[PDB]
Amino acid sequence: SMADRDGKIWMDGKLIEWRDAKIHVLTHTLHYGMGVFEGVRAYKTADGGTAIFRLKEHTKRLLNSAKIFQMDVPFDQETLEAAQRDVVRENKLESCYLRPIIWIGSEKLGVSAKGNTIHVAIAAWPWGIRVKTSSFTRHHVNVSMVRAKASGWYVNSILANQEATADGYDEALLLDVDGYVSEGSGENFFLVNRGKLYTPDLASCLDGITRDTVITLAKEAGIEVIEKRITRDEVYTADEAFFTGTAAEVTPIRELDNRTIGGGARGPITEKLQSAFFDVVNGKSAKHADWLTKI
Amino acid sequence: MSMADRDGKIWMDGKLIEWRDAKIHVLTHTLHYGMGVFEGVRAYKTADGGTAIFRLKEHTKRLLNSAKIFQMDVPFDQETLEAAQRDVVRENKLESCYLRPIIWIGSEKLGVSAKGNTIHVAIAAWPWGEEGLAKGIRVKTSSFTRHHVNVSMVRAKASGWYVNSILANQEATADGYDEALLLDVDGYVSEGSGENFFLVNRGKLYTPDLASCLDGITRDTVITLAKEAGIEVIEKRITRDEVYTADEAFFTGTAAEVTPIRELDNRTIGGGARGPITEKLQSAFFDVVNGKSAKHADWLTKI
Amino acid sequence: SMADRDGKIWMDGKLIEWRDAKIHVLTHTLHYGMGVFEGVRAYKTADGGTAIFRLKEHTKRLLNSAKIFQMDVPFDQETLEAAQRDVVRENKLESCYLRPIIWIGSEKLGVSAKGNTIHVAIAAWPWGLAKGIRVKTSSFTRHHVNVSMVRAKASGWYVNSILANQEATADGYDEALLLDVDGYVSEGSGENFFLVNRGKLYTPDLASCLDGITRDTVITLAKEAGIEVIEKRITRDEVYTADEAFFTGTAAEVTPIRELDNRTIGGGARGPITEKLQSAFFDVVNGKSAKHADWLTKI
Amino acid sequence: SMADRDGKIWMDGKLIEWRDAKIHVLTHTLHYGMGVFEGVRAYKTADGGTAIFRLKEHTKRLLNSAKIFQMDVPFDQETLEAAQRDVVRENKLESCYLRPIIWIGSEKLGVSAKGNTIHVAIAAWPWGLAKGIRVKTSSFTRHHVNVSMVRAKASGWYVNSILANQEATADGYDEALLLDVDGYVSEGSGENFFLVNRGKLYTPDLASCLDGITRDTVITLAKEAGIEVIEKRITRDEVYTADEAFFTGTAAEVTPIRELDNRTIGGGARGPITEKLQSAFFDVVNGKSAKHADWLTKI
């Protein structure tokens, strides 16, 4: 169990024993879906030291998700950044994944309840493919607030992922309400064609930090980056395709809907970009030193 | 105080436990990812002094159907869950009350796509708008759009589904209205943030088709009573401006019962008060839930 | 010119000379399109009298159109039903067409002006069907129900109708048919649409189309004759393969459609259900129907 | 009252007295919505003179709007420019707002009227900014681009604006922001919409929104400051999390938005890029810019 572990969790202003990070079943977010979270990675750098990747941007995105929902968080940004470093340090972790989550408490359990506590907890733990286009449609931008990385949004991801894996695929790819490629269930989507890098415009899809990272490295590598509406059959005829996300970083996609992408192998743009990414997270990059925060 | 900090009994994973011991870890799958399902059920103090749950079979069927939509294997069958609900009312010494069964995904693995998590079940209950029911309420059309039927499984009564309802209800209430009315992605009226919507025009009863909206038990109840009153019930696509010109309008829901709407977007609905068909359906609904109907005695389970 | 006539117009409470029914170019409705109107007919009835068809319902729809716009009309329904009759009476008209219109006046220009006078004016003037018309499906799409309030009969909504109708008549067709934003048949540029197939009467559901009073009249008549009426989404190619089709409107009445997009509808002339409904309609407007006498108001 | 004033209106070829600018209530545009207008300003300049801002571009847009609707305007561009200056000059106006309007007359009052006169009239009259306004996202949806011709500045277009604007003001906000049919931000009820993020300027692509002359002025100024301008689909929650946001229009000039849907924008006052572009805009309209002197016409 992830519940049954030795360690420390930061909760509501202090470190507590991991197993004591409990709440009641009548917690608003459990019933109604309004809570926000992040996924942040720490890496063991070439130093031998450990640093968190883009800590500032992730924490700002967390507080912005809360802002979208008018959730007043009782901690400033600096407290939350320091808390995340503390969780890595006091758990004696090196390469790990951090999960900050902000949720609405147990005072009142109507839909419309106001006056519930806004809770915050932070835990951490140590830390090409075949893809199938999902029969489930990606979020509508005036139904769901797709810039807020919110607990309720993942039902659609779960459904899509479960569909893909039940039939033996590695991951799902979702189309938007107009039938264009939007994203994977937990990742942003990219395609390579004629030496140029394409990605769905920032419309229905999440505003990813790994996406932002890859986009910037591509421009610095002199690769043209185009944001546009992409049809499923552009993917089938692309030269390369890949996913980006905090968990997996850059994953090449060798097949969609049983149509081989390019030669079926990892492509040279995908490799150059994957390498440039490795250099930046292992702290072998002078240019992007400010993306790594040592614990 | 707080809903967590109470004396009584909650049924959880097969047994009654003390209320305060119904606890989950913060790394619980549903808390992070939104896939969980719940019901809201009412128990009423009936005309004969007793207590009875209203449409327990149908709510418990719907709960299990919601889990089925999500391929959540519930480790308890329907009969067990009906009996557990009656136990929670009994052992908390409740009369008129609200029941809240909830099924969620546990703490074993915390990826999006983790499989082999425990499917947990809990049932809590607690005791249970006089002006609104009599005079009607003021409703505002929301700027947020109701769920798309191939994005969200709108027949499944799911935790994640409610973000949209909170946002719409917060907008209405911030500007001083009683409730929100949401339109679907094509601009037709769908439903309230926790209620189904009806309108009356020239002695006929209209409701949005069972398209983007929840398949509501109170809705089903009111439609059956309407038909038993010889009232034509028509499922159709309804524009916001049909509402503005309707003879009457109202909401239905387990919490909401039958709540008349006297105003939408600052346009008065008919005479500005409870309408005569709304009152008739409201009144027949109250007879059925207070155990004063012989026809619908089978909708009440003594508890 | 419609402006240069003898006779009387009812304006803001009283009968005035026709030519004196004038407003300033800085009238809010002229600039910004928020005004509402109606079309109502009077007929010569079998007994030689003259009577307005469904006066109550037309006036209700007019005050409802205002209500939708939150336009506070300074006259009640009894007053506007009385005034309409007065306009027919004083202009010595028999068979004619009435045009009440309610608009926002001249005190303040600017989109968001509050405090303008809400004016009312009623004018009236003297006023295919056996054969069938040729129709063209428009390349312009009909109103979205959350952009325009389609239950309000509003000045601004008719830009769309003008574009469609001009597109049709420029290429030699009689009228346009408009599809909705989903590609399904909605209505003509100023009339509701019906189709007949295997003895049943179909018509687009009351979604984006106008709630026509002629539409309602003909639905009622159809039901009373034992014809099944079905309101559904209709594709253009159900029209091509239908047995009959027609339009309804106050000015139209029931007009048969013999061709859509150069595909012949049925045998290419007026069909038998259309004929029966037309005949039923004329019995009601000419005062031959005891059942429906309260649809006619004498004077 | 805007009808009851001293001054002169240019109408159908000549200056006439202001109160003589009258039309009949049976005027086609009043009933059916197809007429077009333009909003133009004259500003007092730094040399003490007075000039109209982008007269040539506003007049072209007006004539384009009529073209889109196939309204044959009986005056050429040069005549209409001279006419607008004559209206400013002859009413002894300095800082003012000018409103050329073109509409369809009174000869026939059917929907589909051929051979109505195309009328033209021009009037003019004398004519928050600092750390912003509070905006509410409308429940009404913005125009569909194949139902309404959104490039044509059309009387009927404004009914949607009036509805959104009244909804926002009724609840105590300053203005509405409208989403398009797909849920993306389109524009204000009378202004275009811009957001700033990470030192770049974003605006909804010219899709469902108006082709603004202030919008154009501001985009040009931005690019001349070396600010990157990107047209893209913008979600409402992108605005909640943006560094800055503002509106543009002829009447609004550049108005900062400090709050949308009770979410503070940035720090909740006017932002640095908005202030820069606002200052640049005022430098150009007050004639302090040699570079953009050809945007001003001496009166």
Add this chain to the structure above:
Amino acid sequence: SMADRDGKIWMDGKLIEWRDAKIHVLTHTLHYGMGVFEGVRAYKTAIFRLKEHTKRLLNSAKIFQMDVPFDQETLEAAQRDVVRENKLESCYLRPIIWIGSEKLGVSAKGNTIHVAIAAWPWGEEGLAKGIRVKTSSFTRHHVNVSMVRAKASGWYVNSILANQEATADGYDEALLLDVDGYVSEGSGENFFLVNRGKLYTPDLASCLDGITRDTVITLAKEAGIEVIEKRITRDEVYTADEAFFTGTAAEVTPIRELDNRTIGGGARGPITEKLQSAFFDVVNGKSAKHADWLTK
């Protein structure tokens, strides 16, 4: 091979030998998709609803403004003669109308409108136990892009794509949603669901106006079953009492699972069984009532 067989095909007004029914590769329909066809069955008790199929055929040509140089009666007799001359009994008839080889522009007019009719002899436990269906990730036709009442060669690419998607992952058939996300139909069948004793089907909207559908609707009504045409969500299927497909090929086929969710008890439902039996009793001439649906 279907091209290499003993028999007769009726083509452009006369019976020719089967292997003689040939066209050139520069045939307009082959390149541009505008052709129309039918599927008709004959049963051992009779062609089933020959008049109605032949009328739908001529209506499809009409929608496309394809002038067919034969009347309905001629085409009805020809179909009868094609079954006869191949000495067929239980069989499938395929009339096809297409556009010939005169001009290969998109916009070419003055191409010949050809007609050919073939037939050939004609899933028990699928009919008995029910099938496993997968909701497609391809969307069903838009009704102002494709003329969905016309049974048109080009309309079948969407069907093929979907069917292949479903079969590749081991399902029996695909189910397609429309552009709005509602249940439309299978790749060659109409869709029905039963709930609380009542029969539901997507409204005639994006779906094909099926002859088997119509048959089944009429039997249901005669049996006193309420039939409702409405928009249906995919999750309404998952929680339905019963579901099935109708089609000239599919007859009445139960659906026992959709997207790995069991429908009701996982077998053929009682209202499905009753409808399927009414259907087979009609096609095998065991019902006086509907005698005028069979030709002999």
Add this chain to the structure above:
Amino acid sequence: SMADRDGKIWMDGKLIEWRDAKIHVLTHTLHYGMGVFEGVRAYKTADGGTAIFRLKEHTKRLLNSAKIFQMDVPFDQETLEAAQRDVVRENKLESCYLRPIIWIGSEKLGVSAKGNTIHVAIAAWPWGAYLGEEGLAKGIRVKTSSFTRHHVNVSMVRAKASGWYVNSILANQEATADGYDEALLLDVDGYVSEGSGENFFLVNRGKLYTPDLASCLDGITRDTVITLAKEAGIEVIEKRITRDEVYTADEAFFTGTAAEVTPIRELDNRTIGGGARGPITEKLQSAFFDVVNGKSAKHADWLTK
């Protein structure tokens, strides 16, 4: 009749007599619409030679269309490039039109037949530019269709497939029935997509605008003109375009293999600009003719002789 002619057609690996290139009526693609084709030109060039224009990209696109449909084409790309060339040479042609087509054969005729032969054929024939010459010089009259262009998750719009053309036939017939030269289709959202066989361009204030590659086809002639435009220093913008943007544009034109670069002088009875071929259109048309006629060192690899 295109069936009744002297010449050679390449079919399933061989040159045979034109008239022998026959199939049965029971051919899957005739019934079900799954087949794919190209249109490709050859021109007589500056030195008396003749060359096929962008053969590489037309043949890669053909095979990609098969890919999208999962049609296993039994020849690789080289053989098909050479086969197209063979067919121009043997029929002794110069300025001509080539039509390769890949279709599903006659073994099984169920919808989901998954065992047919994948057949391939190439035909070519001559092209007379004078008959379309005045449209090229003076521009054409276009009518917005009441039919909507393909939805990108119903039809695979990057596959140039036999079945997509029903929509094009319908729109074209509607335009030509009422006396217009061509149709313009709007997409499911009301924006300008393309003509029934051509990509659409607009010019305004010196800049070149075209519909984003969304529901419209990824035209080789579209790509050719965008490239030439960028090389001439013209800003190119791919955006959503309303129909009233065309009514007020300074110039407009269609591109396509058949249509080359064809100006549009009127849409929906609204004159485009001065009502004649505009200057930018003329420049880009001349650059296009320069490239196809072998008058450009910059794009010499687009011609195979």
